[PDB]
């Protein structure tokens, strides 16, 4: 298991990164410092996570301390839905760069295929609670992303939460200049994503698995919901390997040639989650984990289900 995967822009991306959604601003600086100290070289960020300044403090301190060189880090962020308008894309990227205290991103993703009305609110609503869409064509958003590569703000561009038809639309864009490097999607044993993963991989697009532990801290979690970390079958596979269930859940996507971005703000877990390069799941283990698929998707919002570009009506 090599530590990095080659992207279609020629750069190498660490297959394990630290997630930062829900990491409290008073905890995330130390979380990122610890992560870098214990070997992480990839941090997954987003403007909408409201903590890029604090993530940036950690990155900057580790660069200043010369714990790691900038070229050895792989920093990812994402363009929020309210910035799909072609004329707003650069400013959104610049705000993220300013907060992270960087002069480039390694990868910048369109966060969701659904564009929303621009404004202060991340989810602009009508009086009945439907999100208010943008009319901006995503192909135009993509052209704006391409400009960021050409202006030196980002080394690679990609997409997130795009279904296969939406990926295909980008790949078929008239005058396409840069292919998406990555599609970042929810993926874990209860939502295994075989069809979309095979499609993306067949096109040379690297897939990043988000919520690999099932996002048990997502704000809309219910007590009765399925729990990957508590699944006795996964616990048994972990026990066989003398590893934790989380470690199995992280190793699983790695062996599918995915990048994976578990989130923690707990120092012991940040370290635990990185200790996944010293064991190998058998192909029988892998197939068994795949068999747990129940098409259980945790990351989607009701307010967006009538948006014309809602990604999850399609089978994949
Ligand atoms: N592109 C998108 O639309 C999108 C959507 C969702 C997520 N993401 C990205 O993917 C990242 C990961 O997904 P996620 O945050 O939804 O959830 P996740 O990584 O599946 O799970 C995070 C939860 O697991 C706990 N945890 C972590 N390691 C553990 C361990 N070793 N043992 C027990 N519990 C452990 C964390 O607790 P503590 O933090 O308290 O330790 C936290 O409650 C996000 O942070 C974000 O960067 C992207
Ligand atoms: O996006 C993230 O990385 C997590 C997240 C962080 C902060 C605020 C909202 C978030 C989600 C979670 C889902 C979500 C959506 C955002 C736009 C569209 C849809 N959808 O279902 O079509 C969902 O947006």
Curated annotation (Swiss-Prot):
Catalytic activity: an alditol + NADP(+) = an aldose + NADPH + H(+); all-trans-retinol + NADP(+) = all-trans-retinal + NADPH + H(+); 9-cis-retinol + NADP(+) = 9-cis-retinal + NADPH + H(+); 13-cis-retinol + NADP(+) = 13-cis-retinal + NADPH + H(+)
Keywords: Acetylation, Cytoplasm, Lipid metabolism, NADP, Oxidoreductase, Phosphoprotein
Regulation: Cys-299 may regulate the kinetic and inhibition properties of the enzyme, but does not participate in catalysis. Tolrestat inhibits retinal reduction.
Uppermost EC category: oxidoreductase
Lineage: Eukaryota, Metazoa, Chordata, Craniata, Vertebrata
Positions that bind substrate: 111
UniProt name for this protein: Aldo-keto reductase family 1 member B1
Active site: 49 (proton donor)
Modified residues (N6-acetyllysine): 95, 222, 263
């Amino acid at each position: 298991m090599a530590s990095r995967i080659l992207l279609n822009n020629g750069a190498k991306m660490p297959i394990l990164g630290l997630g930062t959604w829900k990491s409290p601003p008073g905890q995330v600086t130390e979380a990122v410092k610890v992560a870098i100290d214990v070997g992480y070289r990839h941090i997954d960020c987003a403007h909408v996570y409201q903590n890029e300044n604090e993530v940036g403090v950690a990155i900057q301190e580790k660069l200043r301390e010369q714990v790691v060189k900038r070229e050895e880090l792989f920093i990812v962020s994402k363009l929020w839905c309210t910035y799909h308008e072609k004329g707003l894309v650069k400013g959104a990227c610049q705000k993220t760069l300013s907060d992270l205290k960087l002069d480039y991103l390694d990868l910048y993703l369109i966060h969701w295929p659904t564009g929303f009305k621009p404004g202060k609110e991340f989810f602009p609503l009508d009086e009945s609670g439907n999100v208010v869409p943008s009319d901006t064509n995503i192909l135009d958003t993509w052209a704006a992303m391409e400009e960021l590569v050409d202006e030196g703000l980002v080394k690679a561009i990609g997409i997130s939460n795009f279904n296969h038809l939406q990926v295909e639309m980008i790949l078929n864009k008239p005058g396409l200049k840069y292919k998406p490097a990555v599609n970042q999607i929810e993926c874990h044993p209860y939502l295994t994503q075989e069809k979309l993963i095979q499609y993306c991989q067949s096109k040379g697009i690297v897939v990043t698995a988000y919520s690999p532990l099932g996002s048990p801290d997502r704000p809309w979690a219910k007590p009765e919901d399925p729990s990957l970390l508590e699944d006795p079958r996964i616990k048994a596979i972990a026990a066989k390997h003398n590893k934790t269930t989380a470690q199995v859940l992280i190793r699983f996507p790695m062996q599918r040639n995915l990048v994976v971005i578990p989130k923690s703000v707990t120092p012991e877990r940040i370290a635990e989650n990185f200790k996944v390069f010293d064991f190998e799941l058998s192909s029988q283990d892998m197939t068994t984990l795949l068999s747990y698929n129940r098409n259980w998707r945790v990351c989607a919002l009701l307010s967006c289900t009538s948006h014309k570009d809602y990604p999850f009506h399609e089978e994949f």
